[PDB]
Amino acid sequence: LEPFYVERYSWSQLKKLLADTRKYHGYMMAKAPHDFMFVKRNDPDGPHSDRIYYLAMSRENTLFYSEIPKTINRAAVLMLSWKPLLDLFYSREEELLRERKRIGTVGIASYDYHQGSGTFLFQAGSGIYHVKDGGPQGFTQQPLRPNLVETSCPNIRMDPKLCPADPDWIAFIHSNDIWISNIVTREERRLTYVHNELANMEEDARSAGVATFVLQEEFDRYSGYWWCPKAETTPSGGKILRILYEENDESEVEIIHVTSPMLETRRADSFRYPKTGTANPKVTFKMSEIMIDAEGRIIDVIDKELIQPFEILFEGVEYIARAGWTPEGKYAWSILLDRSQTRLQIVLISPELFIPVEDDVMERQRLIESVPDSVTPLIIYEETTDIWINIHDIFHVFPQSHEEEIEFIFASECKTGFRHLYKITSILKESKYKRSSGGLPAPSDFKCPIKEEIAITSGEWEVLGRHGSNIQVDEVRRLVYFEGTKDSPLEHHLYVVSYVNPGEVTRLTDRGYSHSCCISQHCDFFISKYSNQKNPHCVSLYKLSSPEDDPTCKTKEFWATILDSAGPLPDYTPPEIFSFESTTGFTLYGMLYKPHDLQPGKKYPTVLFIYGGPQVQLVNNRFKGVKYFRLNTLASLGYVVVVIDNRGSCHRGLKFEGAFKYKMGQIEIDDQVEGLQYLASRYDFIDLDRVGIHGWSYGGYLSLMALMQRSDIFRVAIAGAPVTLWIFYDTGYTERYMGHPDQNEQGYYLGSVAMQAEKFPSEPNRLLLLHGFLDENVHFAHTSILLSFLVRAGKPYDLQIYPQERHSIRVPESGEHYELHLLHYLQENLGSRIAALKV
């Protein structure tokens, strides 16, 4: 078998080739419709049943609507036309939230909607706007004009939310405090005076209504306040609006400095970064009680705090993962983790637990004793695990039929080791603990007895509850729709099952496609965004219906196309999904891009693209021609490209994911080498003498671990924004997977490639580091400290910096430069004929 050597192109020629291949995706990279909502027309004479609203790219990302016919012509395919809802007309905190939420889009990211009035509320640049459609006001037949909510506030307003109790009122955050604003009367009040915008960070570390860094980056919570959904009425003919909010104090949290993007200035910004082992922010719940008079004028605002401290009531809790209100508004709920993230608690909190703030210690003591001893925190659910709690967005609460019982659905992996739905009922006992006695409450004094715990789903497959995956609950037919991996770990599908007498899990989506689904609130329609390895993304509307004989049985029917597939683009040859039995017992899946114009008798160089980190699956039956287009470009130049989902990746249950608990770095490369060798025994064309490995972030981490552990296998390594040292990375992530540094000295040591600099090769042109200079997540220090030890160890490196970039590539010129340098490095040090002579 002779070695194939790639066409040695120059830098200017490779730039040309990369430009021309990218130029056939001007029509492509226009993101699919999302954030769907259904609204009934309620017009017996009219030809439409529903109207749907959604966000999409026409350029900027805006609100559109489309009409749902009462009947269709089943001969032809109806393409729904997109009607513009709006008429045609970044700060630091927007720039950071766009990194925290991983938003690549431009325009409107999200929107609120009050059902009763038709009121849309949305942010768009600095402006907070509103429009009306589908309420009593009726349905427009032409573009509405966005109505700016005017303000006195000097700085950007983040995180707007309509009050569900009263759509005249909104709330937003300005300079880390909660404000409210009436969109009719133009009244604007500040509710919290916790932060002083004019002070430094080092003195003023408090905020209200905001999720701190670790919550945004590691728990996907981007808000810290929650409107109560119902308004209490007063004797005046006025009302009392309520807002639950999280208050933080980051005084004890460490302060790192990140380079400012304005490189000219040669300065640096302070960030509060809770590095592993150190203090997380100090959190607590508070409540704002707002008295409104007859016509919508604020009488008074009372700020209320917990009757006892947060640390006493919710013993053991470090993170408020999620929070909200019950639909009735009687209790405020919250999901609470401990530091280790091995104990979850769902806890109801009555508004009567909150008492007014008073500086006067005489006045304060009268209010404390006036609150009854029966009023108490109610832990309605608790679970532990050896591995870790994965936080998700599934938590549905039913209307409270009986007084001292609460009924709810929740998802969990703590029973079987796979995430499944469970209907639960808890008895809301009066607590054993009494506040009059003047002691602290014992560990389990707030726990509620579990009256019922019926498992709705079960098996060797998981329910999805992240990244938009959730559940719709039809409370009429007593069903629950949900997304899962039951038919395959390579395909997401929409399922339905009864939550009362569970049994038959009925699949609604068509096989051979992975689906992402949004179900109507009325449960008579669902939309699926679907794709596979061959065919690009499509978005279709399906009508849900029951047979007359059995309402529990649900079937679907294609209604219309929202977005049509562009079709197979002739440049893109898809990869072939393979699999293999690893010696660990688990089946590991992979993807193979064979070289284009594969000639027999010749063996080709092999780039192995890698991520292999938790919370991610790279190998599945989805279209990879958009995001991983350049893996095909490598295959077109004559590189074998492999990708393997090793142990630790998601969608295979908790035991599979927990394989690297305490041991990050150590197990992953075995799986990759194993899958890589399985292929080379099976295929004559895989040259194992010339193997590259390349990944970003965790993939960059492993690219270094590969070159460090297995220099025999891997000729070159391209490590993008790698973690070189785990004591630098934040608490929320790294303690979840690796524990506290004290209680895993060796795991941290062996997981940190900067501590093992002498184990890198002493041959140049094998290690290439890439890093964004402005990276606030994986600080540049990881690279700079790694390089510091490489210099002392006498080891060689290659380095490329992207000075306009954080933990992302956003400036297009940076990404063009990256792809160009990558191809040229692979060519000069792996693929080409000259790469062979260099050794």
């Binding site: 980190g613 991610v616 972030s697 960059g700 590539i809 297009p812």
Partner: peptide, 10 residues
């Protein structure tokens, strides 16, 4: 999380 983002296209 250790998840890089590629959303800078031409």
């Amino acid at each position: 999380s250790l998840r890089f983002l590629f959303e800078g296209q031409r």
